[PDB]
Design an enzyme around this catalytic site. Structure first.
Site, PDB file in Angstrom:
ATOM      1  N   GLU A 132      49.304   1.218  48.606  1.00  0.00           N
ATOM      2  CA  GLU A 132      50.243   0.165  48.224  1.00  0.00           C
ATOM      3  C   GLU A 132      50.532  -0.770  49.389  1.00  0.00           C
ATOM      4  OE1 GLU A 132      51.419  -0.547  45.053  1.00  0.00           O
ATOM      5  OE2 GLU A 132      50.808   1.377  44.173  1.00  0.00           O
ATOM      6  N   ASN A 185      54.464 -11.667  42.402  1.00  0.00           N
ATOM      7  CA  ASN A 185      53.742 -11.782  41.148  1.00  0.00           C
ATOM      8  C   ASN A 185      54.229 -13.095  40.563  1.00  0.00           C
ATOM      9  OD1 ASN A 185      52.901 -11.635  38.413  1.00  0.00           O
ATOM     10  ND2 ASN A 185      53.390  -9.456  38.216  1.00  0.00           N
ATOM     11  N   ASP A 214      55.289 -13.090  36.529  1.00  0.00           N
ATOM     12  CA  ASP A 214      56.611 -12.654  36.084  1.00  0.00           C
ATOM     13  C   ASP A 214      57.720 -12.962  37.083  1.00  0.00           C
ATOM     14  OD1 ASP A 214      57.199  -9.038  36.572  1.00  0.00           O
ATOM     15  OD2 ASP A 214      56.306 -10.498  37.945  1.00  0.00           O
ATOM     16  N   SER A 227      58.372 -11.788  39.970  1.00  0.00           N
ATOM     17  CA  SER A 227      58.970 -10.677  40.700  1.00  0.00           C
ATOM     18  C   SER A 227      58.168 -10.420  41.960  1.00  0.00           C
ATOM     19  CB  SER A 227      58.994  -9.399  39.857  1.00  0.00           C
ATOM     20  OG  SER A 227      57.686  -8.963  39.566  1.00  0.00           O
ATOM     21  N   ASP A 278      57.127  -7.240  44.932  1.00  0.00           N
ATOM     22  CA  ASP A 278      57.075  -5.832  45.289  1.00  0.00           C
ATOM     23  C   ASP A 278      57.352  -5.784  46.787  1.00  0.00           C
ATOM     24  OD1 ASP A 278      54.700  -3.952  43.233  1.00  0.00           O
ATOM     25  OD2 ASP A 278      56.736  -4.702  42.820  1.00  0.00           O
ATOM     26  N   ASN A 329      59.409  -2.835  42.889  1.00  0.00           N
ATOM     27  CA  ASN A 329      59.662  -4.037  42.085  1.00  0.00           C
ATOM     28  C   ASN A 329      61.091  -4.555  41.944  1.00  0.00           C
ATOM     29  OD1 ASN A 329      59.264  -6.157  40.132  1.00  0.00           O
ATOM     30  ND2 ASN A 329      57.610  -5.010  39.183  1.00  0.00           N
TER      31      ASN A 329
HETATM   32  C1  LIG Z   1      55.859  -1.677  38.383  1.00  0.00           C
HETATM   33  O1  LIG Z   1      56.088  -2.450  37.219  1.00  0.00           O
HETATM   34  C2  LIG Z   1      56.103  -1.631  36.046  1.00  0.00           C
HETATM   35  C3  LIG Z   1      56.111  -2.556  34.863  1.00  0.00           C
HETATM   36  O2  LIG Z   1      54.920  -3.309  34.834  1.00  0.00           O
HETATM   37  C4  LIG Z   1      57.259  -0.661  36.113  1.00  0.00           C
HETATM   38  O3  LIG Z   1      57.211   0.202  34.966  1.00  0.00           O
HETATM   39  C5  LIG Z   1      58.295   0.132  34.116  1.00  0.00           C
HETATM   40  O4  LIG Z   1      59.433   0.643  34.820  1.00  0.00           O
HETATM   41  C6  LIG Z   1      60.606   0.711  34.003  1.00  0.00           C
HETATM   42  C7  LIG Z   1      61.745   1.080  34.908  1.00  0.00           C
HETATM   43  O5  LIG Z   1      62.990   0.894  34.255  1.00  0.00           O
HETATM   44  C8  LIG Z   1      60.376   1.704  32.877  1.00  0.00           C
HETATM   45  O6  LIG Z   1      60.046   2.985  33.411  1.00  0.00           O
HETATM   46  C9  LIG Z   1      59.216   1.203  32.013  1.00  0.00           C
HETATM   47  O7  LIG Z   1      58.897   2.175  31.027  1.00  0.00           O
HETATM   48  C10 LIG Z   1      57.984   0.967  32.884  1.00  0.00           C
HETATM   49  O8  LIG Z   1      56.983   0.300  32.125  1.00  0.00           O
HETATM   50  C11 LIG Z   1      57.186   0.182  37.392  1.00  0.00           C
HETATM   51  O9  LIG Z   1      58.373   0.956  37.518  1.00  0.00           O
HETATM   52  C12 LIG Z   1      57.004  -0.715  38.626  1.00  0.00           C
HETATM   53  N1  LIG Z   1      56.692   0.093  39.796  1.00  0.00           N
HETATM   54  C13 LIG Z   1      57.319  -0.107  40.958  1.00  0.00           C
HETATM   55  C14 LIG Z   1      56.907   0.803  42.105  1.00  0.00           C
HETATM   56  O10 LIG Z   1      58.187  -0.965  41.115  1.00  0.00           O
END
Ligand SMILES: *[C@@H]1O[C@H](CO)[C@@H](O[C@@H]2O[C@H](CO)[C@H](O)[C@H](O)[C@H]2O)[C@H](O)[C@H]1NC(C)=O
Ligand SMILES: *[C@@H]1O[C@H](CO)[C@@H](O[C@@H]2O[C@H](CO)[C@H](O)[C@H](O)[C@H]2O)[C@H](O)[C@H]1NC(C)=O
Length: 130
Positions: free
Chosen positions: A35, A46, A49, A51, A53, A60
């Site tokens: 990462e 990104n 969207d 956002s 990282d 995120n």
């Molecule tokens: C990366 O982005 C993901 C979405 O594209 C995100 O996944 C979502 O996280 C939500 C947290 O509330 C929930 O679990 C959703 O079901 C899930 O799709 C993921 O958490 C992100 N990863 C990081 C490291 O930020």
């Protein structure tokens, strides 16, 4: 700051990451390597969207931290995304732990899925004495 591999492994061990919710240190090391290359100041925006990282774990700003410029932001870690750009990673670690308490766990990071999952990652902790 760019951690050296074993320096990071021991740092994560001290922060209670070894076996946290079933995830071995090797799995966290693999994740961090891919990462951010072990770099606490890494940021990947990104434009689709709007956002970003942040940090060593590339967490995120849409879901986890607040940088004040991301639509739909929920700040589930209740942290400023700037906290994820600090040399001290306790912050980034408390949040990555929050992140893994979601249904998908470590699958929240697809670089882990792509480069770590279903592969032997114990190589990431070899010689670190952890
Ligand atoms: C990366 O982005 C993901 C979405 O594209 C995100 O996944 C979502 O996280 C939500 C947290 O509330 C929930 O679990 C959703 O079901 C899930 O799709 C993921 O958490 C992100 N990863 C990081 C490291 O930020
Ligand atoms: C980071 O990892 C995320 C894994 O959670 C991933 O977001 C996932 O995207 C899927 C397809 O849209 C699905 O909606 C999952 O629910 C969601 O969590 C995100 O795209 C990854 N991005 C990169 C660059 O690694």
């Amino acid at each position: 700051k760019v951690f050296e591999r074993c320096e990071l492994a021991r740092t994560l061990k001290r922060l209670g990451m070894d076996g946290y919710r079933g995830i071995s240190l090797a799995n966290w090391m693999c994740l961090a390597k891919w990462e951010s290359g072990y770099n606490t100041r890494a940021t990947n925006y990104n434009a689709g969207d709007r956002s970003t990282d942040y940090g060593i774990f590339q967490i995120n700003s849409r879901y986890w931290c607040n940088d004040g410029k991301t639509p739909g932001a929920v700040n589930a870690c209740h942290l400023s995304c700037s906290a994820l750009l600090q040399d001290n990673i306790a912050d980034a670690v408390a949040c990555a732990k929050r992140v893994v308490r979601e249904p998908q766990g470590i699958r929240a990071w697809v670089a882990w899925r792509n480069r770590c999952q279903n592969r032997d990652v114990r190589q990431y902790v070899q010689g670190c004495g952890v």
